[PDB]
Design a protein around this ligand. Sequence first.
Ligand SMILES: [Ca+2]
Lengths: 245, 254
Amino acid sequence: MQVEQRTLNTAAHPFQITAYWLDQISDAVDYPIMIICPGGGFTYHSGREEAPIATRMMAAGMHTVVLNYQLIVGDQSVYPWALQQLGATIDWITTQASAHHVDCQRIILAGFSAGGHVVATYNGVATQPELRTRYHLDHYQGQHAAIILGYPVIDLTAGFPTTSAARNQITTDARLWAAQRLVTPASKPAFVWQTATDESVPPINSLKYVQAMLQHQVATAYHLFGSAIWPQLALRWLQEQGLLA
Amino acid sequence: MQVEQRTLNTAAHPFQITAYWLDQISDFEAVDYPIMIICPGGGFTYHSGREEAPIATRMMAAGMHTVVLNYQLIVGDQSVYPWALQQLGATIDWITTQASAHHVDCQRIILAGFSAGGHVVATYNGVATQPELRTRYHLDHYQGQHAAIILGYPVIDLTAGFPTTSAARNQITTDARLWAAQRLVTPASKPAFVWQTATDESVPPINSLKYVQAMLQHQVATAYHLFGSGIHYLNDAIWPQLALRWLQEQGLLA
Ligand SMILES: [Ca+2]
């Protein structure tokens, strides 16, 4: 693989992304790509779990890109900047698509914890014209085919953060507080998983989202483990969705 | 293994069961193995066996006895409850009287319910674990207790999906107190492993979620696996594997 470091800029909010470009086996066919939005309660970007995951997925045959979305650091708000940064990243991939043999019909978004909120919201926002124009995403090219959420934060009042003050710090746009309440038949398929022993992020968050998803008849998969397992289920699910090639 | 057919009676509502007694390894070398009472699906009009049979064989391979309980149906213009619960408690009671002859670990009795059977098991998990309720449905006289329950695409709320009409509901039971098992869940409920496919239309997936949400609410050990495909280190069935692991961690698969 080839590692590419970049600093992109959109809506005057520069962000960092690391692109892990898969290398051809013969050294030609196109491979899927996964964008990873890390956890970190919007105070930092997590990497302890993200590193092993990015590797696992790639081994299955796909490119990966870690998207260090907007944080609250420096007295800032996460939204709507984070969505714009995501759409721009999907865009940055289409331009790199040919040079690195990237299948643009199989772009997958993956979010964890605080990162899961960004990915879950984008799944509701980037899927509706009204929303794409409202949050300025009409000029970005490309679209995702699905998402993977691990112990994701869905509702900004269902546990995390603990104070309304930290909530509004994330964003004062209540319309973006609850990702589940953005799910429409247009949302892309999603694979959700989490442990029932997680104290950092309330399991109800997952349930809330999975329900909405099920209500609007959108392909889904929920795995709430009781206590290497989920990666296998996720990969098998991606095959089912025909997103693995 | 050894198979045993029996027709038990309780509350004046006869019912039938089948027991598959696991055999010991070496006759020269004994130990008590867990037992799984399986309540079949069938929408309360019949007793399913297509999925149940294979499931029993797979779970037994892990080293556990299995009993199949053909609970009260609506046939002959009858109501499922409260008889169903009484029949389940009796079965557990009957097992406790056989545990010494068939090497049964009564500290490891698992209740697995599927489809309509899941309603029985989900309800029992709430009713048998509550004093007031245990007496309201005449269970104070039954011996033994389950340690956990498994649920496969079970019915949880009788007003959200299955059945379709309101008549079929009152038929199953005119006791609204037994319509939504998720409302009978309390910190006393036993750990439950739940699974189901999302594409399943026969019985709305929302049911699972409702019961799981209740379990989480009262901080009761619970796992949930809603597979996207309806076909359903780790072998490539799959849910049986997960469930087994779960029982292992739960220290119930000893
Ligand atoms: Ca014994």
